[PDB]
Design a protein around this nucleic acid. Structure first.
Length: 206
RNA sequence: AUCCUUAUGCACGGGAAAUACGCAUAUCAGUGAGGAUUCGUCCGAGAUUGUGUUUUUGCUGGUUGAAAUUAUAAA
RNA sequence: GUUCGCGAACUUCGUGGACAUUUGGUCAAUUUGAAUACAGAGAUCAGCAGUUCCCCUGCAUAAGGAUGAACCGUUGUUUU
């Protein structure tokens, strides 16, 4: 009740020989072949083009969508860990980038660079879990690594270093505005820093 | 950001089948349908009824035949 | 009586069989107030898509994993 488009015959290289609606099918053999192969390509290309378009639009959406979603978080899972040492760059990098990725409110404090330190990680539960996994399974805090400096590249054998999850709880409010990794010269300083969020307790002296 | 799992949705592509595939102001149904069994047990999702098509829906193309047939106008 | 056969002088005598019958056989159609018709009016070949179920492939969403990536992050005259 329209004739707004038209419906043609879907040829392929197995039909090819059997379609006669479109002309030239034996007349101009290679022309016909080109047409049919070309058609097939278009079909495939169209499919691929469609996929590409979808990919694009999704991407466009996602950026906007993230920005839009400033939802009010009802409850925050938290996990606070502590490590004997982290003179490795790699571990630090992991802690950073992962945190950045996962909207992970928290920090990683420590004493005297080489000394022991704490991580406090907070957010949605899945993210927290992921972080924990990264800490415990993915990273080896008992690995031997290299320090790159001007004086010389220093080998750091650390079989002694280890990592433990202290806490794994739910915090009434997450007072951590972001992920504020730090170092301190002393324990008192560290404590003070911790209490900037009105919460010292996360640390555990052993 | 990279790789994978599942489900789905959209499609390319490749197949098989339409004896199949629906629909319901229906009756029942994981608060058990229908089935297994070595008999101790086991699987666990439709069944009943009614009914619409079902040697097929929608469209295209050819040959043909069919009989396939040619405008006006001035000297 | 009507046929076929055989014995005696086509023709005739002597003789042995067999001898029903009709129903089941109306073209329709049109023009009638019997004529026209005349058996009664798309075929065949071939694509494609649809429907269902499957498998693959790429994309999307949901979820859910796994993994990577250096390095530290935030609460009295020259360097003021």
């Amino acid at each position: 009740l329209g004739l707004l488009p038209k419906p043609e015959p879907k040829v392929k290289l197995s039909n090819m020989m059997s379609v006669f609606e479109n002309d030239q099918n034996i007349t101009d053999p290679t022309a016909w072949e080109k047409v049919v192969k070309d058609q097939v390509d278009l079909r495939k290309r169209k499919h691929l083009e469609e996929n590409e378009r979808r990919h694009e639009d999704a991407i466009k959406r996602r950026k906007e969508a993230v920005n839009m979603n400033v939802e009010k978080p009802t409850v925050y899972h938290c996990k606070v860990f502590q490590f004997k040492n982290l003179q490795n760059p790699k571990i630090r990098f992991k802690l950073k980038m992962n945190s950045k990725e996962l909207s992970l409110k928290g920090l990683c404090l420590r004493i005297r660079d080489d000394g022991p330190g704490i991580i406090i990680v907070v957010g949605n539960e899945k993210s927290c879990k992921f972080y924990e996994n990264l800490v415990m399974k993915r990273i080896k805090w008992n690995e031997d690594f290299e320090l790159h400096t001007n004086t010389g590249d220093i080998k750091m054998d650390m079989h002694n270093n280890s990592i433990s999850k202290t806490w794994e709880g739910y915090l009434q409010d997450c007072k951590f505005k972001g992920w504020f990794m730090k170092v301190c010269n002393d324990q008192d300083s560290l404590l003070r820093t911790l209490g900037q969020f009105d919460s010292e307790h996360f640390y555990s002296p052993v």
